[PDB]
Amino acid sequence: MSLQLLRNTRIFVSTVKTGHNKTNTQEILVQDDISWGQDSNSTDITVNEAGPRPTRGSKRFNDSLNAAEWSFSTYILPYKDKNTSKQIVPDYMLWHALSSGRAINLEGTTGAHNNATNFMVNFKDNSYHELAMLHIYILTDKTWSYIDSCQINQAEVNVDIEDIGRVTWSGNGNQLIPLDEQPFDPDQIGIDDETYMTIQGSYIKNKLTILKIKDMDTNKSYDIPITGGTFTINNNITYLTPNVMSRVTIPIGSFTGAFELTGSLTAYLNDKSLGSMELYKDLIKTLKVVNRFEIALVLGGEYDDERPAAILVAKQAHVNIPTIETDDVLGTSVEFKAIPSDLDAGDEGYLGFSSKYTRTTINNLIVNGDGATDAVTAITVKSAGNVTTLNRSATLQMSVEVTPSSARNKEVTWAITAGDAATINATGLLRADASKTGAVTVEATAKDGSGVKGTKVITVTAGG
Amino acid sequence: EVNVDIEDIGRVTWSGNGNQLIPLDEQPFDPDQIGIDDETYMTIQGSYIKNKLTILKIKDMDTNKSYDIPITGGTFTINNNITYLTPNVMSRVTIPIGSFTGAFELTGSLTAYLNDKSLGSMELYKDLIKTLKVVNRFEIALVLGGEYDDERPAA
Amino acid sequence: MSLQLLRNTRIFVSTVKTGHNKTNTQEILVQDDISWGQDSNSTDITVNEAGPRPTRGSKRFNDSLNAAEWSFSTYILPYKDKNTSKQIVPDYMLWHALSSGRAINLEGTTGAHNNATNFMVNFKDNSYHELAMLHIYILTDKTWSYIDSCQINQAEVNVDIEDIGRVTWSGNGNQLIPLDEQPFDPDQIGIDDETYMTIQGSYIKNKLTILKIKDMDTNKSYDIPITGGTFTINNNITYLTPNVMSRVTIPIGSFTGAFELTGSLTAYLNDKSLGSMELYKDLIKTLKVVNRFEIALVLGGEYDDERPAAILVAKQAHVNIPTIETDDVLGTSVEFKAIPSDLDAGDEGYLGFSSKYTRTTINNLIVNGDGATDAVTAITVKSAGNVTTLNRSATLQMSVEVTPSSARNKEVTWAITAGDAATINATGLLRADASKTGAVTVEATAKDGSGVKGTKVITVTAGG
Secondary structure, eight states, rough: OOOOTTTEEEEEEOOOSSSOOTTTEOOOOOOOOOEEOOOOOEEEEEEOOOOSSSSOEOOOOOEEEOOOOEEEEEEEEEOOOOTTTTTEOTHHHHHHHHHSSSOOOOSSSSSSEESSSEEEEEEOOOOSSSOEEEEEEEEEEEEEEEEEEEEEEEEEEHHHHHHEEEEEEEEEEEEEESSSOOOOHHHHHHHHHHHHHHHHHHOBTTTOOEEEETTTOOOBBBBBBBBEEEEEHHHHHHHEEOOOOOOOOOOEEEEEOOOOEEEEEEEEOOOOOOHHHHHHHHHHSSSSSSOOOOEEEETOOOOOOOOEEEEEEEEEEEOOOOOOOSSOOOOOEEEEEOSSSTTTTTOOEEEEEEEOOOHHHHHHHHHHHHSSSSSOEEEEOOOSSOOOOOSSOOEEEEEEEEEEOOOOOOOBBBBBSSOOOOOOOOOOOOEOOOOOOOEEEBOOOOOOOOOOOOOOEEEEOOOO | EEEEEEEEEOOEEEEOOOSOOOOOOSSSSSSHSSSSOOOHHHHHHHHOOBTTEEEEEETTTTTTOOBBBBEEEEEEEEOOOOOOOOOOOOOSSSOOOOOEEEEEEEEEEEEOOOOOOSSSSSHHHHHHHHHSSSSOOOEEEEEEOOOOOOOOOOO | OOOOOOGGEEEEEEEEEESSOTEEEEEEETTTTEEEEEEEEEEOOOOOOOSSSOOOOOEEEEEEEOOOEEEEEEEEEEEOOTOOEEEEOTHHHHHHHHHHHHHOTTTTEEEOOOSSSOEEEEEEOOOOOOOOOOOEEEEEEEEEEEEEEEEEOOOOOOOOSSOOOOOEEEEESSSEEESSSSSHHHHSSSSSHHHHHHHHHHHHHHTTTEEEEETTTTTTEEEOOOOEEEEEOOOEEEOOHHHOSSEEEEEEEEEOOOOOEEEEEEEEOOTTTTSSSHHHHHHHHHHHHHHOOOEEEEEEEOSSOOEEEEEEEEEEEEOOOOOOOOOOSEEEEEEEOOOOSGGGGSSOOOEEEEEBBHHHHHHHHHHHSSSSSOOOOOOEEEESSOEEEEEEOOOOEEEEEETTTSSSSEEEEEEOOOOOOOOOSOEEEBBOOOOOSSSSSEEEEHHHHTOOOOEEEEEEOOOO
16 A cells, blocks of 8 residues: 655664664665665476477476675765764764674774774775675665675775765675564664764865875876776675575575775876876886886865865775877876785775865875874984084984974984995994095985985085 | 556567568459458457556465555566577578477566555565465466456456 | 688599499588598607617608598488489488498399388398498589598487488598599589479478387387487498508408497486386386387378378387486486397398378388388278177188278288187187187287287177
8 A cells, every 4th residue: 555665765784683772773874876676596497309299398496596685875974973073984884894894893993993083994804704794774664674694795986076975885685684563763773963964064075086196116196187086895795505406595694705996097188297198108108017006096185174085095006007098188097906015914905084184184194094193294304413514434423303293103214325425324323434525415214104305415524 | 579568558569480581573362352341440449458457366376365466567478489490501502491389488577566555565575585485376367458347358 | 723612512422433324423412510531550660779879760651541531411301203203312322332232223122222102221131241332422612532432331310309300421431532533524413403492392300200119028109209319320340451561551342340220219207108207117127138129210200191201110129228317307318229130130120211101101111111011000800791609519710801901911810819618720710619608709910010909709608
């Protein structure tokens, strides 16, 4: 009688089947592109004979149930909750399931976990045969229905100008189940209007898209205006089902396959220095089997005032040779896929979601890994007593200052590049001797990899 | 190909194969007297079948739970799986020679809206997804054109 | 300056190397799988020393040539020719050289001989060390060649349903000889369009395949719808080549081996009466060292109206113990071999080809050996003067009426089966005596092996 409507359907994500509370269930900001359903495998039996009386017969049997299909898209709207005062995306257990299979723990360091500054999602503890287990609850009008033991297969992140920032989720469940009784009241679990105002206070617009590309073999950072992009995280999950003739069967667990983090970035060719054309010609010139690039795509842009933004940080990526795409105005496409340091070392990449980004915050998130931990920005090597020169056979212990003063890693290395008339140790004691009449330089770079440069030309003379 | 869809008038689509298409110069027979006259055309057009009035009779033979399902649109076809056999001669071309009907298939797809009412679409769906059985035995009686006390055209 | 394609090959079968006419050579319609050639043997003489600085050198000698191999596939295409008005298959000399070692005589009664009703092949005259000798002529595009003194080694017939009736020929020849000049005009000898139309009017489809199997030890006919099968006519011909060390040698003569007529028949298991299951259970329950089965494989089906057909008849066959072939639908395999009554008797089996087989024609082919010779179908025995009973010490010379009225064998035998109150002679003069108060029977059967029954229950009493 009463017809169920699509627009009135609300989704609930849970980690447990009983005792649903605010810490285990949430209302998901799903769009109007929802779709789900479970199909089955069937077998037909035909008979082929040669007698005078052919047997035109066909007998059908049900054999098994395929995986339950579910897919929906949500808005990327990071925010801070009033309870914890820490930036968390509304759909945080989805990112936890995509990241690692451990118990949900925002106070840890692996998987989806927040902080006072930003919400960061790493895949360092992803090396599992089975990720975190969810339960997609589908409340269409009044009738209940949920999908048993869902697991996130992939997360489709679309980054295109003229398009608002969104993410599309698609996964599979063991068995979709319809329910008659309410598992839990949706009103108090569902987000109230105040946190809806708090969430809508932060929107991410993909029109402001700035890319950080830097090769680790040459450190040639480029300036590329983005036309449109897309990067997805794939788990390659396959459900395993038994094969029994007598009765039908349902899937039993799964084994996550190979982790894939691929992305496609479209951008216009530029003749300007460090532009798209220079990147393309450098890549098509140095044809190398292996690539090692710093790619840091920043959705929503960067600003001095706190602004909502989404960040991808791929430390050691693999850039496929670009193919310049012909159109009205030449716009090329670059394909990348983040490879790890070691196949089982994790650290494929990590993401940043928060409404409160300053350029320094995103910078230290990119270089150090967290939006809260500070990193060095500039370095000037300091002589032991404002000294400008050195004579032959004289010791000089180099000192150094770093900025900001709140940097977590402040120690720097000591090296000599230009000139051969002195030496430096781990502590910085520069030493000279006889037959040292030439000008020499001294270098200093911190171990956090900010790209900081500490330089000073000391005029080492022959002495008195 | 029988198509049963609302907003669509009842029609059937035929598709088959012949040994060899042949063009003819002489009239095999006069079309006028063989062709239907206007009176039987009036008699035929006196009866139309409209698929908008589609009522389904579904009943399982293991439980006898007849359902009440309003149809959104359907399609059922009868297939013979006919393949023509032709010889393979290198010197000259060849034409098909007879055929052997394969396996008889009578399949159909019925689209209908989910209903919370008793003996509705949702009850049928949940019963089927509850009693997962390899073999099914159902009374399906699709009635194109509807049913009425007065004489009405129906399929 | 030209390349030769396999599609332009034309094959002619001849019994003479000169004076080629339409009665000695005809074209054989071959298919893609045609193949022919001749291989050569060699030898390497290598020195095998053991010391340092050994000799490492070889040497090759051509020593012999192998027998030429040829094979091709043809369609079973019975038809009637306008010249003689007798049913004949286009590759009839192939059948003759397979069947007998005498000169071809279609008017005779052994080997390949035709009739106004059907074309027949029997192996009653194959006791020869060198069967009828052919010469395969090959015409590829423009160049000519032929194989000298061929012999039909075997003829494979595959009952592959949903396919056309086809036979595959194989054999050996003394030597393959390339001919530079045209032996005969292929335009005249090759089949013309009229006979091509007549042939294509008649095709044998393997789908319409009925099989007639009967246990001669129990008189039990089975209804087995076939799934797929094959039967072979094999001669096991081996070609002898002389060994000469100084010069290469080609085969000089041959010798036929053991004539084998085997088969293999696959079918599904049927629970119906006299089905496949009953045959399998009877065969595995008897467990007999020897079996006497009558097998009549009828390609093309049996019908009241005229239809083309190819029939293999095994009068006294030997059936192996069947096995169950576990597939999606359970089945079995009936592997048989046609054995003769006596080793030097021939008559292992025969074949009948025609484009006009009414059911009666194939029936009398099976039971009489020829499609033209009619065979008795039913019998009702008649007394002397329409008498219904008999009294003690009274004669009853019974007669017989048979159908059809044109059966070649109109005679019957006489026997008493049920009761002991009378005795019958060869002519049929039944005789009784006193003290005969029981009901006795009389039976008659034809001498052509049709399987016709003549029965009557005479109510002999003690008299008035």
